[PDB]
Amino acid sequence: SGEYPTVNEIPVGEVRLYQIADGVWSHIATQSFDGAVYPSNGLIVRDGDELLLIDTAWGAKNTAALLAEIEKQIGLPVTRAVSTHFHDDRVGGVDVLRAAGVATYASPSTRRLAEAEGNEIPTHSLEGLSSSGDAVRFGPVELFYPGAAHSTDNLVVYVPSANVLYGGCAVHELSSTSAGNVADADLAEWPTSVERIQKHYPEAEVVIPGHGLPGGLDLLQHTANVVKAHKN
Ligand SMILES: C[C@@H](c1cccc2c(-c3ccc(NS(C)(=O)=O)c(C#N)c3)c(C(=O)O)[nH]c12)N1CC(CN2CC(N)C2)OC1=O
Ligand SMILES: [Zn+2]
Ligand SMILES: [Zn+2]
Structure with missing residues (x-):
């Protein structure tokens, strides 16, 4: 009923959308992994009369449900998708997207890691993002490679029209007391990468983490704090 939807509010398989700004929504889904949800x-x-999607809904059936929810709530076609790193919460569902006419994209680093891991592989490579601090335009967003953080390949996404910073899994929500799933992380580089984000997007008004509640710029500093403390 208007609040940002949370884990126990979304059955696995269902997707909800949340309006962030004019022409910007987040999508929220839930998934089981190693026996936890x-x-x-x-x-x-929004990309004119089309939509740009950032990240799958973490699984094939969730991603099909995402497409259905988009059609219900928005009614414009998803034509392109970008996955912001190689994990299943970002690429799982790419095959569904690819069969629904969506052109799927990721950096070459993400594509190589997804392939090596046995995850679904976006079709198209995003060049121009291989060095930290790199940025490229992609439709209505800017893609930014901040350096290694949650993963070596993690990208963030900025929506300049709305000053929305989508941090993906390099950014945690404010309630985070732990650094999330750090299996593929670079805890030593993560604060430097967050500092790069902070420097590059000082006008961000909404910051969206890969998991959990959006907030403001403080999510960035909080993330750096939690990651440093986890490493400590
Ligand atoms: C697919 C993905 C993955 C799965 C499950 C949970 C998370 C998490 C994660 C954790 C705790 C969390 N909150 S809480 C109160 O502590 O429980 C929250 C939150 N809110 C999120 C994140 C993240 O933090 O982004 N991502 C996850 N995976 C898999 C993976 C490495 N696996 C070994 C193989 N190489 C694949 O690495 C990763 O990220
Ligand atoms: Zn991840
Ligand atoms: Zn994640």
């Missing part, structure tokens, strides 16, 4: 976010950005 987790929420995760993605982004939807």
Whole structure:
């Protein structure tokens, strides 16, 4: 009923959208992994009379449900998708997207890691993102590679029209007391990568984490704090 939806509010398989700004939504779904249930976010950005999708809904059936929810709530076609790192909460569902006419994209680093891991593989490679601090335009967003953080390949996404910063899994929500799933993380580089985000997007008004509640710029500093403390 208007609040940002949370893990116990979304059955696995269902997707909800949340309006972030004009022409910007997050998508929220939940998924089981190693016997626990987790929420995760993605982004939807209006791209004229089309939509740009950022990240899958973490699984094939969740991603099919995402497409259906988009049709119900928005009614514009998803034509392109970008996955912001190689984990299943970002690429799981790419095959569903690819069969629904969506052109799927990721950095070459993400594509190589997804392939090596046995995850679904976006079709198209996003060049121009291989060095930390790199940025490229992609429809109505800017893609930014901040450096290694949650993963070595993690990208963040900025929506300049709305000053929305989608941090993906390099950014945690304010209630986070732990650094999430750090299996593929670089805890030493993560604060430096967050500092790069902070420097590059000082006008961000909404910051969306990969999992959990959006907030403001403080999510960035909080993330750096939690990651440093976890490493400690
Ligand atoms: C697919 C993905 C993955 C799965 C499950 C949980 C998470 C998490 C995660 C954790 C705790 C969390 N909150 S809470 C109160 O502590 O429980 C929250 C939240 N809110 C999120 C994140 C994240 O933090 O982004 N991502 C996850 N995976 C898999 C993986 C490495 N696996 C070994 C193989 N190489 C694949 O690495 C990763 O990220
Ligand atoms: Zn991840
Ligand atoms: Zn994640």
